[PDB]
Amino acid sequence: APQQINDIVHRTITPLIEQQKIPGMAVAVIYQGKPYYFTWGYADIAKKQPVTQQTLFELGSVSKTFTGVLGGDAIARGEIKLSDPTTKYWPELTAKQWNGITLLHLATYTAGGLPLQVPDEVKSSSDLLRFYQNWQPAWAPGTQRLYAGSSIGLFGALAVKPSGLSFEQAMQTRVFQPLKLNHTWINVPPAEEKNYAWGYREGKAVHVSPGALDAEAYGVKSTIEDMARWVQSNLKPLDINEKTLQQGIQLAQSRYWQTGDMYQGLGWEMLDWPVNPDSIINGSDNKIALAARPVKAITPPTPAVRASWVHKTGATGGFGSYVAFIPEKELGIVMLANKNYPNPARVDAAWQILNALQ
Ligand SMILES: *C(=O)[C@@H](NC(=O)/C(=N\OC)c1csc(N)n1)[C@@H]1N=C(C(=O)O)C(=C)CS1
């Protein structure tokens, strides 16, 4: 690393780890195209395994970025349109509240109050139809954004129906493989388990459990290297040889709705750069990030704007992550930790690092 990068990383990450008691963390900095890696602490406290560049972290809701891109790749292949009604892909959704709710609404949390999580009692396919058939909206479609795994989760499950593939198999073949993300998994294969960090919640070692629509909303595990390569791929999508993937990435950073000073893409969220850091830092706090807000349609959607801060927070019960980049500045960051610590602490550290490098 250039000395600039070590100094701001160490001066920023050391106090964060101490403040938050994070057992293991990996950071990548993307700077003038190339990634620079830092690791601290333990993947596995008990067995004294260090965090390395090969350690797998659970990405949590950062998985929604892969989901948004794969959905974008399906649009670009001609298989779906964001203007299609939900019912085109799930006809059994016959309850009348589903009228007028499109793929766009699902992908962007604007369907009218679909909930944060799919409840744990929803295990089977028929439980899932049931859950969506019996849900009643809080609002008309396309008036309020409420951040929701049940919403983007359903988008991803529907968006792969036309391809004929499982969502897993579509993600593998259409996103992971072409980008050479070869240590990124929805299901960790048994031979790779030795690299799988434990998550820590109130001291207990934990992994994420199976759940309805887990792959679509929070199901990806990856390494700091592969996540660096995911950021580079989203920073510079024209370098990607597969046409539909290249367009898919650009569709996921298109601006569909605005609330306050933020815009909703497909899994990614964006703000104009130069950004006010107060708004990203405070905006990431759950009190705000999880609240319903009114949305203004961007008519028509703005194509990926280079001069943007593009980002996503994610957590599971035992992990906490964050990815942010700025395409105009050829700059990005990935922060993976095996503890779920508050979002504003993540964003503030990323902001400290990146504004220092621009
Ligand atoms: C995304 O990260 C998603 N998070 C979750 O679904 C979980 N935990 O979040 C704190 C989760 C999934 S499986 C498991 N054991 N835990 C949504 N994101 C957030 C977030 O802070 O980004 C949440 C508020 C919970 S829901």
Record keyword descriptors for this entry.
358 residues, binds CEFOTAXIME, C3' cleaved, open, bound form, Beta-lactamase, 12 helices, two-stranded antiparallel sheet, globular, alpha+beta
Major β-sheet annotation:
10 strands, antiparallel
CATH fold title: Beta-lactamase
Shape: globular
Which quaternary structure do these chains form? monomer
Strand content: 15-25%
Element order: H for helix, E for strand: HEEEEHHHEHHEEHEHHEEEHHEEEEEH
InterPro entries: Bact_CellWall_Synth/Modif, Beta-lactam-related, Beta-lactam/transpept-like, Beta-lactam_class-C_AS
Catalytic activity: a beta-lactam + H2O = a substituted beta-amino acid
Subunit structure: Monomer.
Keywords: Antibiotic resistance, Hydrolase, Periplasm, Signal
Describe this structure as you would to a colleague.
- The protein is α+β, with helices and mostly antiparallel strands.
- It has one domain (1-358): Beta-lactamase (3-Layer(aba) Sandwich).
- Helices cover 34% and strands 21% of the residues.
- The protein contains twelve helices and 16 strands.
- It has helices spanning 3-20, 63-76, 103-107, 125-134, 149-159, 167-179, 214-218, 224-235, 243-252, 277-283, 286-289, 343-355; strands at residues 24-31, 34-44, 49-50, 57-58, 144-145, 199-201, 204-206, 221-222, 255-259, 262-264, 269-272, 293-294, 296-302, 308-315, 320-326, 331-337.
- The strands form four sheets. It has a ten-stranded antiparallel sheet, sandwiched between helices. A two-stranded antiparallel ribbon has the order 4-8.
- The chain is globular and about 60 Å long.
- CEFOTAXIME, C3' cleaved, open, bound form is lined by residues 60-61, 116-117, 149, 208, 211, 218, 286, 290, 313-317, 340, 343.
